[PDB]
């Protein structure tokens with residue numbers, strides 16, 4: 001579960017261990033211990049070997065520092081991404097798909113972790129589906145009616161208007177649909193009746 | 205001196221608003237690198253090829269060879285991961301339905317062609333045709349181009365038959381005309397615009413696909429390929445340098461000097477070649493970091509541009525983004541972003557509110573525009589004037605407070 | 618040199634002798650005893666990769682000689698290289714131990730097998746111009762996303778590291 005953070009810690013430890021171990025390499029010198037070089041050889045001779053050791057160790061240090069700089073750049077990119085998620089995922093809700101966990105994001109909770117941050121993304125995922133017949137619009141009195149919100153469905157006998165992300169059929173009314181054009185334009189319009197809430201009040 | 209573009213001046217005034225009366229569906233092609241060549245160099249063979257004495261002398265320097273082999277291997281594994289993140293975002297390999305009655309939209313150019321030896325779509329074929337042994341080897345990518353093609357076709361089939369739903373949960377079939385109605389709702393243009401003009405939109409989209417095909421018929425990807433090839437060729441060529449040694453060829457030095465003497469020459473060559481190798485590895489690490497940023501951007505676009513819809517401006521094409529279609533390409537991904545761009549604007553006189561009986565009415569959605577004699581309320585991204593009524597406007601406050609309120613009548617249904 | 622000596626299909630011009638390659642390596646040497654324009658090819662080389670399931674599960678392993686013909690080395694040929702010790706199975710599964718070129722290995726019924734990864738199950742969508750699937754229920758799921766943020770604030774006293782007092 002913690003692969004990403006454990007890999008970071010292991011990489012840093014490996015870098016340090018390699019750097020320390022480099023001290024023992026001869027690098028072409030008679031020995032990897034500086035005092036042994038000083039004692040065994042004369043100063044004029046010892047200078048060459050010590051210079052070779054210094055060259056080797058400086059190259060090793062430079063390699064370590066370059067690796068550290070690159071890895072720190074990668075971690076900075078990760079930290080910028082984490083800060084962006086903290087801002088757009090915890091302190092708010094995000095419309096960005098798959099930015100804040102699979103599904104339609106609801107919220108997040110941050111948690112600290114050694115050298116990292118762990119988000120718990122709470123998301124809403126549709127579960128069960130039913131096949132319905134649908135048509136873009138409904139013509140009632142020669143004028144097309146389109147849903148204000150959600151889509152039209154049919155259970156095989158009657159037409160209803162339901163919100164897009166959750167089945168909750170309701171009677172089609174002039175308060176749920178708006179009129180635009182006539183039946184002669186829309187492709188796939190279907191014939192039905194749109195109930196008028198106002199009519200019964202005036203009839204009685 | 206460069207022009208910086210054409211000059212323009214907007215006819216701005218405190219009571220003038222331009223409303224678009226027509227629209228164009230434009231498909232733009234955005235190309236992104238995703239992965240690079242998986243190189244691998246054996247430091248021992250590159251530096252001291254087949255020379256036991258040279259290998260022994262190199263051993264002194266310690267773990268330089270090991271950590272170079274670790275860094276290059278890390279780059280290779282990261283490249284495989286980049287491909288995985290960018291493409292393998294669909295749980296289930298969908299396939300397009302046998303009957304392609306997508307509301308008149310013709311996708312045949314982007315969908316796979318079964319007749320080809322590799323199930324790639326026409327655009328993928330054009331893209332593929334567009335882009336073109338001493339210790340160095342190339343490790344083949346984990347996913348062959350055929351599997352990349354399968355993944356892109358699955359993403360595309362889901363985007364066509366299920367919209368964004370397959371991004372959230374199980375792919376929910378939905379007629380393509382209604383899917384575009386949803387997307388038009390997303391950009392703010394009421395859905396009736398789509399149905400009332402489905403044929404025009406379909407023709408515009410098909411023409412856009414044809415134009416993209418003609419345009420393709422790839423600078424960024426070729427740039428990556430050329431840069432990696434250049435780095436490899438430089439690394440290979442460095443082997444010919446003397447670095448102060450009598451001769452670049454190690455074997456000649458071996459048969460030229462006694463072991464004690466040849467030691468100095470071999471040390472000079474080893475330092476030179478090791479420095480060159482370190483330089484190459486650092487350059488590769490940095491360029492691979494750049495490619496990881498590019499591949500992460502590509503994954504983000506795939507997620508928020510294909511599987512969904514973007515409200516982010518200019519992140520997904522230039523315009524009111526409608527949708528996207530992925531396509532593979534050698535070491536990269538090409539997006540066809542379908543966007544809704546208004547055009548054929550017209551000047552109208554505007555006003556922030558309208559007073560009927562001392563009550564100030566404001567539009568629920570859309571703005572008030574007059575053709576000079578009458579006032580109407582119209583959606584902001586299209587010209588659909590409608591009579592001003594209590595249903596289209598909500599009351600608030602009174603006439604005095606607002607600035608620029610004009611007098612009119614609000615019809616009562 | 619050490620290589621495979623093979624008569625060159627390319628022929629040196631009568632003056633041409635002892636050519637080199639772009640890499641500066643000896644591409645071909647004209648036959649000294651009897652001019653034959655002999656070419657040199659580096660002997661096959663590659664990387665050995667030990668594909669092994671966790672030792673706790675089993676100690677059985679397979680070997681991948683990368684980018685070498687199986688002849689040069691139960692051997693299975695893959696674009697990645699030659700795979701020795703692994704059984705080739707037509708059935709596809711989810712990639713477990715990636716090998717390359719679409720080939721993945723795993724440990725299953727028990728031995729090590731190599732195969733082509735499936736990429737996931739096939740699911741055709743029942744699309745049609747008047748059919749829609751609208752969810753009737755939902756689920757609230759909590760997923761974990763782990764991000765590195767900082768790395769150890771190391772520092773090195775270069776003078777003391779290089780020189781031991």
Ligand SMILES: *[C@@H]1O[C@H](CO)[C@@H](O[C@@H]2O[C@H](CO)[C@@H](O)[C@H](O)[C@H]2NC(C)=O)[C@H](O)[C@H]1NC(C)=O
Pocket residue numbers: 190191
């Ligand atoms: C929906 O109803 C309308 C009328 O309410 C139908 O329109 C009829 O179409 C036929 C065939 O052209 C004409 O002969 C009739 O005169 C039309 N009716 C009217 C009132 O003009 C339409 O066909 C119906 N569609 C469906 C799918 O049931």
Ligand SMILES: *[C@@H]1O[C@H](CO)[C@@H](O[C@@H]2O[C@H](CO)[C@@H](O)[C@H](O)[C@H]2NC(C)=O)[C@H](O)[C@H]1NC(C)=O
Pocket residue numbers: 226227404407408
């Ligand atoms: C909106 O613009 C489109 C094209 O930008 C118009 O469609 C063109 O209409 C002309 C008629 O003036 C035809 O000659 C072209 O063949 C049409 N092109 C296409 C691609 O269909 C459309 O008429 C415009 N609509 C309005 C209301 O102005």
Ligand SMILES: *[C@@H]1O[C@H](CO)[C@@H](O[C@@H]2O[C@H](CO)[C@@H](O)[C@H](O)[C@H]2NC(C)=O)[C@H](O)[C@H]1NC(C)=O
Pocket residue numbers: 310311312313
């Ligand atoms: C979708 O577009 C393709 C090409 O853009 C159409 O295929 C062409 O079909 C015509 C006959 O209808 C042939 O004469 C051409 O040679 C075909 N071209 C290619 C490249 O195959 C296809 O018919 C279109 N389909 C729809 C439904 O519009």
Ligand SMILES: *[C@@H]1O[C@H](CO)[C@@H](O[C@@H]2O[C@H](CO)[C@@H](O)[C@H](O)[C@H]2NC(C)=O)[C@H](O)[C@H]1NC(C)=O
Pocket residue numbers: 575576577578
């Ligand atoms: C502004 O729009 C109104 C609304 O249609 C126009 O008034 C109509 O004009 C047409 C002729 O163009 C007449 O047939 C209608 O009887 C008019 N109806 C009403 C309610 O006035 C008006 O002409 C338009 N003015 C301009 C300058 O475009």
Ligand SMILES: *[C@@H]1O[C@H](CO)[C@@H](O[C@@H]2O[C@H](CO)[C@@H](O)[C@H](O)[C@H]2NC(C)=O)[C@H](O)[C@H]1NC(C)=O
Pocket residue numbers: 609610611
């Ligand atoms: C809009 O109409 C209102 C009344 O319907 C106008 O208010 C009048 O303002 C004048 C100038 O101060 C007063 O003398 C009147 O008594 C006001 N009318 C009423 C009913 O009190 C207002 O001026 C009109 N505005 C415009 C721009 O035409």
Ligand SMILES: *[C@@H]1O[C@H](CO)[C@@H](O)[C@H](O)[C@H]1NC(C)=O
Pocket residue numbers: 129130131743750
């Ligand atoms: C809808 O009908 C198709 C017909 O092939 C079927 O496969 C599918 O399972 C149905 N919907 C659901 C939710 O099962």
Ligand SMILES: *[C@@H]1O[C@H](CO)[C@@H](O)[C@H](O)[C@H]1NC(C)=O
Pocket residue numbers: 187188189305746747
């Ligand atoms: C849907 O397509 C079928 C053919 O597959 C056709 O008979 C029917 O009229 C179409 N209906 C609509 C609304 O497009």
Ligand SMILES: *[C@@H]1O[C@H](CO)[C@@H](O)[C@H](O)[C@H]1NC(C)=O
Pocket residue numbers: 215222548549550551
């Ligand atoms: C609006 O008026 C300005 C006045 O300069 C004119 O330039 C512009 O073309 C007009 N708008 C349209 C859509 O014609």
Ligand SMILES: *[C@@H]1O[C@H](CO)[C@@H](O)[C@H](O)[C@H]1NC(C)=O
Pocket residue numbers: 218219607608609
């Ligand atoms: C707009 O500005 C003009 C002056 O440029 C002024 O006469 C007019 O009253 C202003 N109208 C509104 C609604 O602000």
Ligand SMILES: *[C@@H]1O[C@H](CO)[C@@H](O)[C@H](O)[C@H]1NC(C)=O
Pocket residue numbers: 686687688
């Ligand atoms: C390997 O060698 C065999 C015969 O020795 C040959 O048939 C085959 O094509 C070779 N394959 C490769 C990849 O070199």
Ligand SMILES: *[C@@H]1O[C@H](CO)[C@@H](O)[C@H](O)[C@H]1NC(C)=O
Pocket residue numbers: 705706707
């Ligand atoms: C896979 O099936 C083919 C026939 O399609 C057969 O020739 C081959 O031997 C099978 N694989 C194995 C490992 O037997």
Ligand SMILES: *[C@@H]1O[C@H](CO)[C@@H](O)[C@H](O)[C@H]1NC(C)=O
Pocket residue numbers: 127754755756
């Ligand atoms: C919805 O699903 C939950 C479990 O996921 C279940 O307890 C509940 O009864 C379901 N609701 C309906 C109406 O089936």
